[PDB]
């Protein structure tokens, strides 16, 4: 269960790779605006990669919701988790990557007690 929302539509599901990120290892896939005066990518020719522009902005009513319908919140300890006690249908706590296993089981205990959804409960747990 989550706070009600419409369908989560993503106007561009594919990642915006950089122009020649495939041709060269030295060119990363991190997006970069092509600044060349004769860049067919910048001039927006037919048959080239799409570039980010504000038209692809997600719906404001849905912009930060995960597929479960929650906005993700990073928690590192029980104290951080309890800030979502009154916001349980609008937020789901995600446990930070560096929280140790014992502190993670403490977090899961408190989260289940408060009913807060935890995004990655499987975590470092190898019971």
């Amino acid at each position: 269960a989550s706070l009600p929302h419409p369908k989560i539509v993503k106007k561009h599901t594919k990642k915006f790779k950089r122009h020649h990120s495939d041709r060269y290892h030295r060119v990363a896939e991190n997006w970069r605006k092509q600044k060349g005066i004769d860049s067919v990518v910048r001039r927006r020719f037919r048959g080239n990669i799409s570039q980010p522009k504000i038209g692809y902005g997600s719906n404001k009513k849905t912009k930060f919701l995960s597929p479960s319908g929650h906005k993700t919140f990073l928690v590192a300890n029980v104290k951080d988790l309890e800030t979502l006690t009154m916001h349980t249908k609008t937020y789901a706590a995600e446990i930070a990557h560096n929280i140790s296993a014992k502190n993670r089981v403490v977090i899961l205990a408190r989260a289940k007690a408060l009913g807060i959804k935890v995004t990655n409960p499987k975590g470092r747990l190898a019971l």
């Binding site: 296993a101 014992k102 499987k122 975590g123 747990l125 190898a126 019971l127």
Partner: protein, 92 residues
């Protein structure tokens, strides 16, 4: 082709390819190299995937060695499991 215009060539190759492709796929599926169904008891959907953990429990249950468990990680898993068993011991 241009020498044998009355034989299908592309279509014959595509039929042969689809036959050999799913014969190979079925051979792989019967040997069980493919992962089981999501509803299977042997599947790991929704649960963490770890080469090290799988090898540790395969050595405890008692080969493939491209997937190898280091003695370092084996000791770490044993220590973590001791902690987890102590936690279940304080639970019960």
């Amino acid at each position: 082709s241009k020498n044998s215009i009355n034989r299908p060539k592309l279509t014959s190759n595509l039929h042969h390819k689809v036959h050999s492709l799913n014969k190979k796929r079925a051979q792989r599926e019967r040997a069980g190299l493919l992962k089981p169904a999501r509803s299977s008891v042997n599947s790991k959907s929704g649960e963490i995937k770890s080469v090290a953990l799988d090898l540790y429990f395969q050595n405890k249950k008692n080969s493939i060695t491209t997937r190898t468990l280091s003695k370092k990680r084996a000791k770490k898993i044993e220590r973590n499991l001791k902690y987890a068993t102590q936690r279940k011991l304080l639970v019960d």
